[PDB]
Amino acid sequence: EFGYIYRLAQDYLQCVLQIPQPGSGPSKTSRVLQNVAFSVQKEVEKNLKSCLDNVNVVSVDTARTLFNQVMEKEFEDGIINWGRIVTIFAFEGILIKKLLRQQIAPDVDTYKEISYFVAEFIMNNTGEWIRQNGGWENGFVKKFEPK
Numbered sequence: 001e002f003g004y005i006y007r008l009a010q011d012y013l014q015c016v017l018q019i020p021q022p023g024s025g026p027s028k029t030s031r032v033l034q035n036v037a038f039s040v041q042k043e044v045e046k047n048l049k050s051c052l053d054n055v056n057v058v059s060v061d062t063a064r065t066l067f068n069q070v071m072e073k074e075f076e077d078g079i080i081n082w083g084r085i086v087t088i089f090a091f092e093g094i095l096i097k098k099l100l101r102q103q104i105a106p107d108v109d110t111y112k113e114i115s116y117f118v119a120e121f122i123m124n125n126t127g128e129w130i131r132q133n134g135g136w137e138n139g140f141v142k143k144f145e146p147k
């Protein structure tokens with residue numbers, strides 16, 4: 001459901017911004033996702049560096065416009081795989097760091113608005129593929145957990 005993906009998206013932004021995580025901590029799926037996405041983001045940032053330097057992410061609306069443009073090119077051939085889904089999280093980690101430097105508004109809670117539209121994109125555009133490929137715990141985790 002939506003609430004599950006919204007939680008993964010918020011946890012990943014929390015990981016990128018190094019904001020503390022209390023108690024129970026992230027679920028095993030969240031921890032596997034954070035480890036994989038952190039490594040993809042390192043590659044993505046280097047490859048998209050010129051694009052990132054060209055843009056002014058002054059607000060959540062600007063971040064959404066840029067996210068929409070990047071998703072349209074990322075999925076141009078129509079194919080979905082776990083690598084491309086991890087790339088969606090890597091891109092939200094990149095947008096939140098741009099917002100941290102360039103956002104005009106003094107609003108720290110903008111990451112929850114970012115997590116929200118990213119999760120609605122993952123659900124609306126890739127939700128049927130995720131359900132066909134085993135879901136998060138029985139598909140994503142099984143593929144990316146250490147053996």
Ligand SMILES: */C(=C(/C#N)C(=O)NCC1(c2ccc(C(F)(F)F)cc2)CC1)c1ccccc1P(C)(C)=O
Binds near residue numbers: 048050051055066069
């Ligand atoms: C980035 C392009 C190059 N080379 C490119 O690959 N465009 C793809 C595109 C995009 C949009 C926004 C971003 C990001 F927000 F991360 F910055 C990345 C990619 C879907 C459109 C680039 C490089 C140098 C100068 C301009 C650009 P733009 C942002 C005008 O495409």
